[PDB]
Design a protein around this nucleic acid. Sequence first.
RNA 1: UGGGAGAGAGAUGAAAUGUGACGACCCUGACUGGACGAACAGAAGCGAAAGCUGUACACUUGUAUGUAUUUUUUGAACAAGGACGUAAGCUGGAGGAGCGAAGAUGAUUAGAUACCAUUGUAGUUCCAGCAGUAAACUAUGCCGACGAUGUGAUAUGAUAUUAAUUGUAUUAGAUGAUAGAAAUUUGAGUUUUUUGGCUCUGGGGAUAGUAUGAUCGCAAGAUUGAAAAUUAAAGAAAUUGACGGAAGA
Lengths: 167, 97, 131, 210
Amino acid sequence: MKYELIAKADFDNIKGLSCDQTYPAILSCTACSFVHPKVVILTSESTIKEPNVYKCNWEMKCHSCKNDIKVSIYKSPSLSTVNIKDRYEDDVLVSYNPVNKNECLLSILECSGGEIREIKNVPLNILTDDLRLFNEKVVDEKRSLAEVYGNNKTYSIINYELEIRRV
Amino acid sequence: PVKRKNHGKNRKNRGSCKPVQCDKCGRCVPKDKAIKRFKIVPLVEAGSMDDVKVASIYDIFEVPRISYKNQYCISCACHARIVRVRSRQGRKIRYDG
Amino acid sequence: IETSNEYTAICHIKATKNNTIIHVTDITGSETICRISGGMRVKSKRDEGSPYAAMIAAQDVAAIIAKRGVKTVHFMLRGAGGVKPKALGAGAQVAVRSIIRSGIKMGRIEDVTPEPTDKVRMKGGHRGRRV
Amino acid sequence: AIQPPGSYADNFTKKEWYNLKAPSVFPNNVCGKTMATRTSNKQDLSTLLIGRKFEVNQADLTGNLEEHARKFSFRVNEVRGKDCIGVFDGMHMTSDKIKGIVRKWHTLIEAEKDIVTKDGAILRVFVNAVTKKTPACTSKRVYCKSSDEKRIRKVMFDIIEEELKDQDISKIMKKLSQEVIGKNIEKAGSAIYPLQNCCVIKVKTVKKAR
RNA sequence: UGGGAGAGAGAUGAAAUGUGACGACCCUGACUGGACGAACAGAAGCGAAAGCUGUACACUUGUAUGUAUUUUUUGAACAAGGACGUAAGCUGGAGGAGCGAAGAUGAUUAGAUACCAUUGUAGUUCCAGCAGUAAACUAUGCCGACGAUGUGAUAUGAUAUUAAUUGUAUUAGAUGAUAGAAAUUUGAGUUUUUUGGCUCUGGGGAUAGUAUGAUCGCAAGAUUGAAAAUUAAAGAAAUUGACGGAAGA
Ligand SMILES: [Mg+2]
Ligand SMILES: [Mg+2]
Ligand SMILES: [Mg+2]
Ligand SMILES: [Mg+2]
Ligand SMILES: [Mg+2]
Ligand SMILES: [Mg+2]
Ligand SMILES: [Mg+2]
Ligand SMILES: [Mg+2]
Ligand SMILES: [Mg+2]
Ligand SMILES: [Zn+2]
Ligand SMILES: [Zn+2]
C-alpha cells in the first residue's frame, strides 16, 4: 500500500515547494475496522532496526485486535537544486521540489499494517519563480495565502488542498 | 556406541524399501523410518451443531466424518512436538493401539 | 412445485490456508449465479485467508442470492487436492455458518476433495525445503 | 479490493427457465429448475440443453430416509416443451462410506468387469469386499492367503456376468438400488472364507447408445 | 477446444520480481500425451547379494514338511580363471508430463556468486553395449557337536474332535545365567585348567591411499602401492561438573 503526498491548487509566480519531513496523521487497522482516536506525529529521524526480520520508521500495536502496524517514510524522487544569490553578492546552493502543472509531490509513505486516513497541515517553504526564497509560511483558514514583494511583485496560492492516493 | 536395538527403524530380513515423501518439507524418507498418525474429524463443527437443526429441510439425518493419514520426516516431527525426547530407561515402552 | 421465485441450488467452497472462494450455481453446474472470493473484500495480503474476511465474504453472498430466488442450498466442500496437502482451511466452518444465519435452509453436505491414485514428484530436493 | 483501479490496464434478466425430468422408474421424477439464455427471436435453444449432466441423490428419488449412500447421474438427450428428459449413464458411491469400510489388520479384495446391456452400450462395474473376524479370537492376524484371493475373484466374475447379462435398463437400475449383487456375493463368497461389507463402488459407461 | 461470468489469482516468517480485460482464476462438455500403482501395508513373505506391490493368461524357479523310492561315498573351503552388481557418468538410435545440477534475476546481509522465491539446459523414461565405485552396515567370513524358562509369527504332520495339546525348519521380544575394559550379550559362551577343518586382513600417529612402474578402459578413472624429512601422543567405553540461540512440570 504505497501512498504519496500531492498538493493541488492554483499557482502563479512560484517555482517550487519544500517542507520538513514531519506529518501528523490518523491511522487505522486493517484486521479490525478501528480508528485510532488520537493523532500521531511521524518523523523521518526516528529509526527502529532489527537485523534479519524487518526494519521500519514507526511502530504500533493495536488495542482491539493487537495487529502490528509499521510505517515507513521515503524521500521524494524528483528532487532538484538551483543556485541562488543572497543580499550580499555570493552564491548558495538550495534544494527544493519542482512544481509541475497544477501539482506538486512532497514525499512517499508506505504501510504494512494499517491505512492512513487524513494528514494535517505543514508550514511549507515557498520558492519564488523570479529567484528568491522565503523560509516558513503557514496556510490560513481560507486555504489561500498571498504575499506581496516590495518591488511590486506578488505570488499567491488559491484553494490549497492536500490529498492522498494509493498506487 | 549403539543407541537403540533396532537401529533406526523396524526392518528385518529385507534389503530395501521404496521411499515416500514428507508433506511439510518434502524430503524423501523410507517407508519404515516414518512417523504416521491417524485422526478422524467431522465435516461440521460442534459449535455449529444446533444451528443446522433449525435450517434442516430433513427430519433426522446423520453428520458424516472423514479420515486422514499423515506422513513426516523426523526433523519435521520433533519440531512440531508430535514426538518428544524420553528418558533412557523409559525409551523401551511401546504404546500399541 | 418449483416456481421461478424459489428453487434449490448447489454451493461449492474451496478453502485453503491462503484463500477461500465461494461459488454458488444451479443444479447443472453450467451457469454462475454468484461468485465472490475472500480476497476481494480484504485490503492486506496477509489477511486473504483469515476467518475475519470470510464472514464478510459470506454475508454479501446472502444479499445477492436473495434477489435471484434461491430457497434451499446444497453444499460441496473440498480442499486444495492433488499434490497439495488437501487439508481443510480455516475459512470452511465460518462460511457455512453465516449463510445459514441469514435465513437460508440447507439441503445436503458432501466432501469432494480429489485424491490421486498416484503422485508425481513434489517440489523440493532430496534434502527438502530448508528454511 | 486489493487492486486499485488505475494501476492495471443485465444478462440474468433475459434468461428462460426449464424443468428437469428423471426416467419414470423412480416415483419422484421431478428434480429442479435450470436456466438458458435466449439471444434473440427465431433461435432454437435445444442444442444447449442436451449436453448437460445433473446428479440426484437416490434417497430423494425413492422418497426414503433409510439409505442415502448411492448416487445417480443422468444424461439429457431430448426436450419436450419446457421439460428435459434424462437417461441413466452414471453411478458412484459417496466418498465417506468408501473410506469407512477399509481397516488395518484386515484383508481387502476388489475386482471389476466390463459388461454389455441389451442395447448398444458397454458398462463397467466395481465390487469390493473385506474379511470378517473369526470366532477364533486369539488371532489379531485375520489375514487370508493369496491363493484364496484368486478363488474369490472368480466368483466375483460369475455373479457380475449373471446378474447383468442382457437385462434392460429398468432391470439394470432397480437391481442396483435394491443391492441384489453384494448380498448374493456374500453368501457365495463365504464358503471359502467368511466375508463382510460387500458392496458396489462405481458404475462406468464405456460407449454411448445409438 | 465448446458454454457461463468479468477482477485479481498464486507463494512466504513477512514480502518483492514474475503473472491477468488479445478475458486468467473458478464451475461445466469433450480430447491427446508422459510418469506412477494411494488407503490395506506389519519389527509379515521371497531372493546368492544389489532387490521385489493394479488385473487375466503364457513360459520359467526356490526352501521347508511327510514317506519300507534309485545310487553308493561322489564331502567343506579356495591361489589361477568366470558371472551378476542401487545410484550417478559415457558413446549410438526413440521420447520428453512433472522434477531439475550449470547459467541468469528479486529480497536478506558489512559482504553473499549460500539457505528463501521466480525461471531455466543436460539428465532421470525405452532398446542395444561399455563402466565396476558406496556408512554395498547385522560396521559381526564359511562348515560341524552340545545348551534355561515365558509370551508371539510363517509353513506343515500326528493325536483328537468343536475342545485342545503336540512333532520338524526358520524368526521377533522379555527375565535370569555366562563372557567382557564397558556399553551390552544364546553367542561376542564352552580360554592362561589356552588346539575339529579352510581362505583373507592389521602392527603408534601423520606424510598418504600421495608419488613411480606395470596391467585394464572411448574417456572419466579403477586394482596393486612406497620413501626422505617429522612427532609424545592419537584413540575406545564410562562417572562428576559447566554450557545450550534445547524440551517438559
Ligand atoms: Mg542397502
Ligand atoms: Mg493397490
Ligand atoms: Mg520357511
Ligand atoms: Mg594357498
Ligand atoms: Mg579372484
Ligand atoms: Mg557387466
Ligand atoms: Mg571401497
Ligand atoms: Mg566392510
Ligand atoms: Mg560380508
Ligand atoms: Zn486492529
Ligand atoms: Zn519433512
